[PDB]
Every structure is written in C-alpha cells, then in structure tokens.
Amino acid sequence: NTRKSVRIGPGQTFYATGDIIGDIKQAHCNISEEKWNDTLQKVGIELQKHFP
Amino acid sequence: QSALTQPASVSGSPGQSITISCTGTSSDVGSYNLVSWYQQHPGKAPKLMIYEVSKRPSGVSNRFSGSKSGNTASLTISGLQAEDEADYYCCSYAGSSTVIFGGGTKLTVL
Amino acid sequence: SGGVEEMKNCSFNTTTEIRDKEKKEYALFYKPDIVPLSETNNTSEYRLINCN
Amino acid sequence: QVQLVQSGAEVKKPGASVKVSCKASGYTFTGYYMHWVRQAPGQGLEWMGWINPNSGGTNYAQKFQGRVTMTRDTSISTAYMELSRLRSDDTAVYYCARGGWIGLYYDSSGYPNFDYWGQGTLVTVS
Ligand SMILES: *[C@@H]1O[C@H](CO)[C@@H](O[C@@H]2O[C@H](CO)[C@@H](O[C@@H]3O[C@H](CO[C@H]4O[C@H](CO[C@H]5O[C@H](CO)[C@@H](O)[C@H](O)[C@@H]5O)[C@@H](O)[C@H](O[C@H]5O[C@H](CO)[C@@H](O)[C@H](O)[C@@H]5O)[C@@H]4O)[C@@H](O)[C@H](O[C@H]4O[C@H](CO)[C@@H](O)[C@H](O)[C@@H]4O[C@H]4O[C@H](CO)[C@@H](O)[C@H](O)[C@@H]4O)[C@@H]3O)[C@H](O)[C@H]2NC(C)=O)[C@H](O)[C@H]1NC(C)=O
Ligand SMILES: *[C@@H]1O[C@H](CO)[C@@H](O[C@@H]2O[C@H](CO)[C@@H](O[C@@H]3O[C@H](CO)[C@@H](O)[C@H](O)[C@@H]3O)[C@H](O)[C@H]2NC(C)=O)[C@H](O)[C@H]1NC(C)=O
Ligand SMILES: *[C@@H]1O[C@H](CO)[C@@H](O[C@@H]2O[C@H](CO)[C@@H](O)[C@H](O)[C@H]2NC(C)=O)[C@H](O)[C@H]1NC(C)=O
Ligand SMILES: *[C@@H]1O[C@H](CO)[C@@H](O)[C@H](O)[C@H]1NC(C)=O
C-alpha cells in the first residue's frame, strides 16, 4: 500500500508498510525460454574450446 | 465515487442499429480498460455480453460491438429484434479491488 | 487478512515526539526481517533481526 | 455441467442477522473468485466485495464495512454470508457469481468478468 509514517524521537520519521489493498500474489521474475536455451548452448560450445 | 453515469431509457424500432453509452471518472474508466456490459431480463439472473471493452465471449451472436474512447464507453447493436427486451448495465474497475456499476437503460421495442 | 503468509503484522509501542509518552502503532514487516526472541515457547515476542 | 445454487427466500426483522449460502458444483471450486451482488427491486444492481476461496482472503466495498462477513468452506464447497444489523431497504435479491482465474502471479481480483450466476435469493424485511 503505502509508506505509513511512524514518528520516533524529536523529529525522526520512519517509513513502514501500511495496509495491503487487493489480493496477495507472489513476486516473480520472467525470462524467455528459447533465448535462454540457445544462449546457454552458445556458452556451452564456446566452453569446449578449453575442455577438450 | 458514485455509480456510473447512464441514461434513463432508450427506444428502438426493430431492424435498426442503436448505440448506448456510459461516462464516468478518468480514475475508474479513463485509466483501466476493464469495462464490461451486462443485461437483465425481468425475473431471472443477468447474462454477460462482453468481457473487455471489445473482446467477444462465447454463446453470443456476432452482433454486439463495444468501444472505448477516453472517458466514454459504448455498445452498438445492429439489426435489433424484439428478443432484446432487457435493460443494460455498465460494470467497471475502480482501483483498490472495487467494482462500480451503472444506473440502467431500459430498452423498448416498437 | 488471514492469508498473507509472507508478512506479519507486528504491532508495538514506540516513543512519540514527547519522550515522556509512548503510543501504540503497527506495521507490516517482511518475514526474513524478523527473528523470535526465545525467552519462552510463545511465538509472539518477535524482534528485528539487527538488534544484536 | 455447472451449478450455483442458493437458499430460499427469507423474511426478517430489523436489527437481526441473515445468512446467505452459495454452493458451486460441476467445477473445481477453489480455483476461481466469487463476487456477490445485491439488487433492490426497481433499481439497478449493486456490487459487494469478493471472496478468495483458497486462502479465505476478504475485501469488501465501501459503505458495507463491519456489518458483512464472508466465509468459505471447501469440504462442502459453499460460500457463506453473515449480514448483521439489517435496515429497511435491504429487502432485495442476492446473487453470487464466478470471477476471474486465480493466477498466483497477477492480481485478478477486481476483474469484472462474471460468467455464471445463481438463481437469486429473496430477502424481505419489515
Ligand atoms: C510471467 O510469466 C508467467 C508465466 O506463467 C505469467 O503468468 C501467466 O499470466 C497469464 C496472464 O495472461 C495467465 O493467463 C491466464 O490463464 C488463465 C488460465 O487458463 C488455463 O486454464 C483454463 C481453465 O481450464 C483448466 O482449468 C479447469 C478447472 O477445473 C479444468 O477443468 C480444465 O480441464 C483445464 O485444466 C484453460 O481454459 C486455459 O486454456 C486456454 O489457454 C491455452 C493457452 O495455452 C490454450 O491453448 C487453450 O486452448 C485455452 O484457450 C489454460 O489452460 C486463463 O483462463 C486466462 O484467460 C482469461 O483471462 C484473460 C484476461 O482476463 C481474458 O482475456 C481471456 O479471454 C480469458 O478469459 C476468461 O475469463 C474468465 C475466467 O474464468 C472466464 O469467463 C473464461 O474462462 C474466459 O476464458 C489468462 O490467459 C497464466 O495463467 C499465467 N501463468 C500461470 C502459470 O499462472 C505472468 O503473467 C508473467 N508476468 C508478467 C507478464 O508480468
Ligand atoms: C494500488 O494501491 C494504490 C494505493 O494508494 C491505489 O491508489 C489509490 O486508488 C484509489 C482509487 O479508488 C484512489 O482513490 C481516488 O482518489 C482520488 C484523488 O483525487 C479521488 O478523486 C477519487 O474519488 C478516489 O477517491 C487513491 O487516491 C489512490 N491512492 C493514492 C495515494 O493516490 C491503486 O489504485 C492500487 N492499484 C490498483 C490497480 O487498484
Ligand atoms: C544475533 O542474532 C542472530 C539471530 O538469531 C543470530 O543468528 C543465529 O545464530 C544461531 C546460533 O549460532 C544460528 O543457529 C542461526 O542459524 C542464526 N541465524 C538465524 C536466522 O537464526 C546470531 O548468532 C546472533 N549473534 C551474533 C551475530 O553475535
Ligand atoms: C506497549 O505500551 C502500551 C502502552 O504504553 C502497553 O499497554 C503495552 O503493554 C506495551 N507492550 C506491548 C507488548 O504492547
């Protein structure tokens, strides 16, 4: 939701998490599949130059 | 954040197109494109006509069409018959997981 | 709302702008920020992870 | 196929509480949202807050907070409503409807895509 503002001391402000509006969902990160696969395969074919 | 602004009623002769519209608040309709249209027959449960501003559901004739322009949202029907004796309702997202409906447009055939 | 499962509520008391008086406040801290103070078997005396 | 059945018509006194049930059959009940609406006779429909039958999460609309509680039960697969402190205009017809898909990665709460409905419950007060 928001930066709920708690006041501490003579003028110090501490910002925290207030409510949550909406439902709860998970935090994800998305990578494309085939781009990752052939980039990984290119690293593989460039890594067999050192290991025979 | 009251109900969406909707006309009172419209009258339509059979066999001609008619357009009905809602207007609202830019924070509700003018930002999110999650606008749907429902219709009601007197006595039974309502039935859905459109999901998005224009993306067709299943089990419905290819006759309704929806459009969104800024604040305004509109439904056009073409070649209307007497089987559409229903009243129409807007349905919109509003933020904070709240849904705002509309007033209602009674449709009378001739 | 009874179904978050990653963030706790964690109400506490704190010093206001007057250092004599204290007030009751709340937040929503994330779960890895928080460790239990094991002075008993009660799972309600939680604390912040940086406090030692 | 699919069914959304509810209880029969009820009459009540003001200041009481009313319980409305909505049972879903024919599909996996814990995989979709449920939104409820209320229609006074003569005027239009009116939204009420949704329910998440997986984790029991609740959100309610404005001018309803405090006097409505919404629960679910996955063993009988039925959503319950307890509404206390009735008032004179609450003589109405109550519907339950199926919402969007529980996506686990995107917020599909307020998506206004109601496909299947119940038969309606008549609640009268005097
Ligand atoms: C990061 O990446 C991740 C990658 O996963 C992203 O997450 C993904 O985000 C998208 C958002 O667009 C989600 O898409 C949504 O998926 C749902 C679920 O669809 C599946 O289930 C359908 C139900 O059928 C099953 O379930 C019943 C339950 O009992 C069983 O009995 C059945 O046997 C089935 O098992 C099923 O119909 C779906 O199949 C359809 O899609 C596939 C695609 O591969 C086609 O081949 C099929 O032919 C078929 O068309 C699928 O298996 C969808 O339902 C959502 O679509 C609805 O919502 C849209 C937006 O609201 C709307 O525009 C659509 O038209 C559609 O509308 C529906 O609305 C109502 C919902 O009930 C109904 O009226 C009706 O069903 C109607 O169809 C949507 O597409 C992904 O699920 C999600 N991935 C995961 C794993 O969760 C993430 O977004 C990325 N992050 C970003 C971009 O930031
Ligand atoms: C994600 O969370 C934020 C939390 O702030 C939501 O923002 C809030 O959205 C509501 C919409 O109902 C805003 O209310 C409106 O405020 C304007 C202010 O002029 C008022 O004119 C309207 O009548 C209405 O009350 C609210 O202000 C806004 N919060 C802030 C700080 O601006 C946001 O909507 C959430 N996202 C989604 C997709 O729901
Ligand atoms: C300060 O507190 C932290 C939090 O409890 C301590 O970290 C734990 O220490 C125990 C004992 O060694 C380990 O078994 C745990 O795995 C540690 N982590 C957690 C998350 O509990 C830490 O030891 C404390 N003392 C210091 C830093 O001197
Ligand atoms: C915090 O302070 C309030 C008032 O000063 C007091 O009632 C309460 O017992 C304190 N402790 C906790 C854990 O809330």
Structure tokens, D122: 């008549």
Structure tokens, B43: 């006595």
- Max CA separation in chain B (angstroms): 43
Cα nearest neighbour of B94 on chain A: A22
User: Given ligand 1 and candidates D77, D101, D111, which is best to mutate, with the most ligand atoms within 8 Å of its CB?
Assistant: D101
D47: β partners: D37
Whole-number Cα distances in Å, B73 to B67, B70, B84, B90, D94: 6, 8, 20, 9, 27
Given a contact cutoff of 8 angstroms between Cβ atoms, the answer to whether D48 and D87 are in contact is: no
Q: Which of the other chains make 3 or more beta carbon contacts under 8 angstroms with chain C? A: A, D
Given a contact cutoff of 8 angstroms between Cβ atoms, the answer to whether D104 and D54 are in contact is: no
HEC profile for chain D?
CCEEEECCCEEECCCCEEEEEEEEECCCHHHEEEEEEEECCCCCEEECCCEECCCCEECCCCCCCCCEEEEEECCCCEEEEEEECCCCCCCEEEEEEEEEECCCCCCCCCCCCCCCECCCEEEEEC
**DSSP label of C32:** G
Closest Cα to atom 7 of ligand 1: D105
Q: By C-alpha distance, which of D50, D48, D49, D37 is closest to D92?
A: D37
Given a contact cutoff of 8 angstroms between Cβ atoms, the answer to whether B56 and B50 are in contact is: yes
Show Cβ contacts of residue B71 under 8 Å, excluding neighbours closer than 6 positions: B23, B24, B25, B26, B29, B30
Show Cβ contacts of residue B104 under 8 Å, excluding neighbours closer than 6 positions: B6, B87, B88, B89, D43, D44
Rounded distance between C-alpha atoms, residue D83 and residue D67, angstroms: 6
In this structure, what are the phi and psi dihedrals at residue A13, rounded to the nearest 5 degrees? -120, 130
Among A20, A23, A24, A31, the residue to mutate for chain D (most D Cβ within 10 A): A23
Rounded distance between C-alpha atoms, residue B13 and residue D94, angstroms: 33
HEC profile for chain B?
CCCEECCCEEEECCCCCEEEEEECCCCCCCCCCCEEEEEECCCCCCEEEECCCCCCCCCCCCCCEEEEECCEEEEEECCCCHHHCCEEEEEEECCCCCEEEECCEEEEEC
Q: Amino acid identity, residue D48?
A: M
- Is B13 in the A-facing interface, judged by CB distances under 8 Å? no
Rounded distance between C-alpha atoms, residue D6 and residue D38, angstroms: 14
Rounded distance between C-alpha atoms, residue D70 and residue D52, angstroms: 10
What is the dihedral sign for C-alpha D120, D38, B94, D67?
Answer: negative
Given a contact cutoff of 8 angstroms between Cβ atoms, the answer to whether B66 and B81 are in contact is: no
Given a contact cutoff of 8 angstroms between Cβ atoms, the answer to whether B75 and B37 are in contact is: yes
Q: What is the resolution of this structure in A?
A: 3.8
Given a contact cutoff of 8 angstroms between Cβ atoms, the answer to whether D33 and D48 are in contact is: no
Q: By C-alpha distance, which of B88, B81, B79, B89 is closest to B107?
A: B88
In this structure, what are the phi and psi dihedrals at residue B34, rounded to the nearest 5 degrees? -95, 75
Tokens 């006595």 belong to residue: B43
Method by which the coordinates were obtained: cryo-EM
Q: Which of the other chains make 3 or more beta carbon contacts under 8 angstroms with chain B? A: A, D
